[PDB]
């Protein structure tokens, strides 16, 4: 039997631990385990188990935990995760809500009313056990909800009647086993949102006039505090929806009142606030202090919200019960004390709750509701998988699904408010945290931290600024493996460059120690070998080292068409304080031997890599040229300009680089018909670094130097003349010659 | 612990350093039925001949006592 175990040991403990194993093996969301355990325990078995009054308390608690963790555990967790968000669509029912029910306006029932927030999708399944699929999603089948709704409230009325009667024989052992699983199931059902309408009205009639006046132990107090927290969250959501309705009507009213008064000199030209100043600057300027007669409704609804409530509502009951609980006796279990005082402060600081909930509120259009729901489900899956071995494929699928969504680029502020930045950051930290070799190497989270985030969002002076916070961690762990720099070499440096891509303020805000770090990482590549693509061993691949660091420094030092002097000074100082390249032409010096380095590279190109050394040197000289001070563009008198110019000119050798810029390994490549070597050989834009350094430092200050050079790309000019074939060197040589604007001086 | 001081075999002193404690008279026997400590002494009282003394180990933390057992590789009535 089962009730015989109430007097026999060594079996109650073992069965209780078996129930604990059944619940724990299906924890934190599972698919196969839930359906498999739906066979060992059944719906009528669970109904009879929760129905029995003489069941031992341990088995009662175990069965309640098993039912919760099998049948109703995933959607409850998803709703608890997404409760703090307040995504509200635009519908005629959304703006039809009122802050107060009627003109009586006493307190209003918290759970009773109309809600329109975008909640996650309810969808259960069936166990079947002779079928295909039904496991990947839609967890353990719907244990019936109407009979649960009736029975839970029925035997909760029975339990509160027994507690008020103060009997000496509870359902289980002490009253803890009687009350804790019941209130736990009630709270789970409530946060699922199944309770509503007359059932919720009956619940409020049951737990108010209520069991709070009775005497309860500590875990029951904790669960009631959680229930009151949920009620206050529902009230805050109702307030947010009322604010959404008001800010939907009043925004249109003020839009008309601003569109009609466009221009009807002037009164300070209105500071172009009509057209060039209609943004958040106008929104801050169009306050309710002193502007037109529209502010009457603004003040009226400010008072309506700040009636100190939605003293006259559930707040006084909550505070009185909390004071009585604190007065009754000393309280152990510091989690209970923390929850108690958190709830008390939340009741006394409803304005704090409002100002917390306001920034995360967003208004989405009614046409993309389904797409927003799909994106929210994808984010819920990502957050469930947050903080794997084979879950990497599921995360890849989720990220790919969130890639092809219109809401991502059409609503970047909503994306930032939803906080995917910290989610992806935590995922990346968990993936690469540990050292060694980053065992689960599949860097798509870096592509998502980059790519659409900070490309399609266009920063708006906010997204790139928020991304700038994790720059130190991004550049510190310069891992390897991403396909964006062709082969390995930099997975997060693309994100670091995209953070400061085209933001002058962020480039100015870049700290000197970060640049010092990056300079040290560049200087760490003081080695050379004859292998194909070796890094520390195993020269396997025969298909960039410090070129990625040089590209990041170029992006950090040159924003728009302009060269940041403050960054350039420290960059050039730390470059000349530690030589990097290995120039054989200089030999005795640290490096920068461009006289013979490119010749040796082009000689070893047709030898047993190739474009790697030439590209590295080109990136170095391009960084140096973009690092040069602007020649008379802003300042030409004196002061840290001729100094840096002379320092750059010292590297004599760089004065004469005609034999490199106008060198003739032009190579027709395709020529007549074949041999279009893209991989090995100098690029048409490889001399763009040469001409950029020349224009930035020396330039054509006189026509004598131009006549000495005659034609700058003389052999490139001959190659372009011979290109009159296509699909060859000419495709990029056209761009290279178009970048040669220096004749227009 | 034999101590000859021949500069080549050092002695040990940690196992020998004792710290004494509250010294009472023989007529101050305590243990009136039951008795924690609740000491009634200021301290730093100089030990006089005949006072009951308590020894405590500075390292082992315990108290030197006369065990209720016997033998200890001896053949007598001793403890």
């Amino acid at each position: 039997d089962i009730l015989e175990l109430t007097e026999q040991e060594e079996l109650l403990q073992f069965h209780y631990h078996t129930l604990r194993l059944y619940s724990a093996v299906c924890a934190l969301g599972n698919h196969r385990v839930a359906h498999a355990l739906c066979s060992h325990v059944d719906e009528p078995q669970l109904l009879y188990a929760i129905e029995n009054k003489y069941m031992p308390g341990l088995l009662r608690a175990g069965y309640y935990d098993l039912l919760i963790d099998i049948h109703l555990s995933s959607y409850a967790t998803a709703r608890l995760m997404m409760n703090n968000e307040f995504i509200v669509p635009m519908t005629e029912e959304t703006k039809s809500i009122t802050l107060f029910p009627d003109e009586n306006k006493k307190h209003g029932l918290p759970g009773i009313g109309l809600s329109t927030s975008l909640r996650p999708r309810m969808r259960f399944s069936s166990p079947s056990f002779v079928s295909i699929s039904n496991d990947c999603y839609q967890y353990s089948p719907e244990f019936p909800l109407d009979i649960l709704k009736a029975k839970t409230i029925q035997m909760l009325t029975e339990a509160v009647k027994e507690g008020s009667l103060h009997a000496r024989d509870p359902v289980g052992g002490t009253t803890e086993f009687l009350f804790v699983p019941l209130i736990k199931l009630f709270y789970t059902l409530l946060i699922m949102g199944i309770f509503h309408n007359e059932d919720l009205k009956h619940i409020l009639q049951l737990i108010e006039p209520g069991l709070l006046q009775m005497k309860l132990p500590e875990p029951v107090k904790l669960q009631m505090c959680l229930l009151l927290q949920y009620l206050c969250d529902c009230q805050v959501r109702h307030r947010i929806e009322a604010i959404v309705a008001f800010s939907d009507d009043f925004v249109a009213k003020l839009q008309d009142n601003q569109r009609f008064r466009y221009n009807e000199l002037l009164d300070f030209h209105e500071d172009l606030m009509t057209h060039c100043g209609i943004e958040l600057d106008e929104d801050g300027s169009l306050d309710g202090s002193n502007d037109l007669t529209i502010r009457g409704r603004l003040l009226d609804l400010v008072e309506k919200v700040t009636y100190l409530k939605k003293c006259s509502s559930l707040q006084q009951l909550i505070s009185e019960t909390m004071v009585r609980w604190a007065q009754e006796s000393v309280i152990e279990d510091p989690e209970l004390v923390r929850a108690m005082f958190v709830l008390l402060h939340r009741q006394y600081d409803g304005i704090g709750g409002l100002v917390r909930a306001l920034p995360k509120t967003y208004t989405i259009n009614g046409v993309s509701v389904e797409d927003t729901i799909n994106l929210l489900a994808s984010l819920g899956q990502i957050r469930s998988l947050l903080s794997g071995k084979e879950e990497e494929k599921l995360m890849i699928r989720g990220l790919g699904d969130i890639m092809n969504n219109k809401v991502f680029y059409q609503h970047p502020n909503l994306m930032r408010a939803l906080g995917m930045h910290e989610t992806v950051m935590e995922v990346m930290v968990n993936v690469l945290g540990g050292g060694e070799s980053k065992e689960i190497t599949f860097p798509k989270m870096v592509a998502n931290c980059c790519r659409f985030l900070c490309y399609f969002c266009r920063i708006s002076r906010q997204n790139q600024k928020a991304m700038f916070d994790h720059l130190s961690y991004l550049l510190e762990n310069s891992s390897v493996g991403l396909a964006s720099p062709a082969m390995r070499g930099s997975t997060p440096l693309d994100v670091a460059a995209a953070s400061v891509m085209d933001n002058n303020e962020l480039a100015l805000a870049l700290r000197e120690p970060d640049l010092e770090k990056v300079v040290r990482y560049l200087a760490g590549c003081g080695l050379q070998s004859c292998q194909m693509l070796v890094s520390k061993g195993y020269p396997d691949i025969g298909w960039v080292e410090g070129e990625r660091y040089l590209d990041f420094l170029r992006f950090a030092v040159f924003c728009n068409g302009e060269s940041v002097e403050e960054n350039a000074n420290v960059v050039v100082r730390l470059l000349i304080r530690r030589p990097e390249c290995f120039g054989p032409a200089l030999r005795g010096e640290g490096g920068n031997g461009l006289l013979a380095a490119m010749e040796e590279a082009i000689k070893i190109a047709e030898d047993p890599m190739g474009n790697a050394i030439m590209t590295f040197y080109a990136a170095l000289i391009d960084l140096l040229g973009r690092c040069a001070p602007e020649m008379h563009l802003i300042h030409a008198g004196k002061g840290e300009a001729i100094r840096i110019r002379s320092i750059l000119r010292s590297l004599g050798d760089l004065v004469g680089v005609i034999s490199i810029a106008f060198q003739m390994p032009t190579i027709a490549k395709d020529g007549k018909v074949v041999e279009p070597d893209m991989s090995a050989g100098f690029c048409p834009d490889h001399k763009a670094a040469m001409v950029l350094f020349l224009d930035r430092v020396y330039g054509i200050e006189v026509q004598d130097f131009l006549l000495h050079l005659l034609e700058v790309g003389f052999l490139p000019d001959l190659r372009a003349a011979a290109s009159l074939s296509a699909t060859d060197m000419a495709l990029a040589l056209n761009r290279y010659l178009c970048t040669a604007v220096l004749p227009l001086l | 612990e034999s101590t000859s001081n021949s500069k080549n075999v050092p002695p040990d002193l940690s196992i020998c350093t004792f710290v004494l404690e509250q010294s009472l008279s023989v007529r101050a026997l305590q243990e009136m039925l039951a008795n924690m400590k609740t000491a009634q002494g200021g301290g730093h009282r100089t030990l006089l001949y005949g006072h009951a003394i308590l020894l405590r180990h500075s390292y082992s933390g315990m108290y030197l006592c006369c065990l209720s057992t016997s033998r200890s590789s001896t053949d007598k009535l001793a403890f």
Partner: protein, 107 residues
């Protein structure tokens, strides 16, 4: 092989068509009196289309033998089962199944 032992007769001539669903209230139990699955206690009948491999071959063949309103008592050899691998976590490998289906209606 189907080893139908009919306990109660039904229509006597009704057979399930290809485009029809067999509404049943099966309570199939494993050997040694072990009830691995039950569809009646869930208060929800089972639907499956014949010829679409939506159900195990033994259940499909057993439904193709009973008539309308015919209470049946089927058994399933390990041929018409989850194979030598078996259903993970519920069905042991290389085991037989016993079915006691009761078709309520045919649609």
């Amino acid at each position: 092989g189907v080893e139908i032992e009919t306990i109660s007769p039904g229509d006597g001539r009704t057979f399930p068509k290809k485009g029809q669903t067999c509404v049943v209230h099966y309570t199939g139990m494993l050997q040694n009196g072990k009830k691995f699955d039950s569809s009646r206690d869930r208060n929800k009948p089972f639907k499956f289309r014949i010829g679409k491999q939506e159900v195990i071959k033994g259940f499909e063949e057993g439904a193709a033998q009973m008539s309308l309103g015919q209470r049946a008592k089927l058994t399933c050899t390990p041929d018409v089962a989850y194979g030598a691998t078996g259903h993970p976590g519920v069905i042991p490998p290389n085991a037989t199944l016993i079915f006691d289906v009761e078709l309520l209606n045919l649609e």
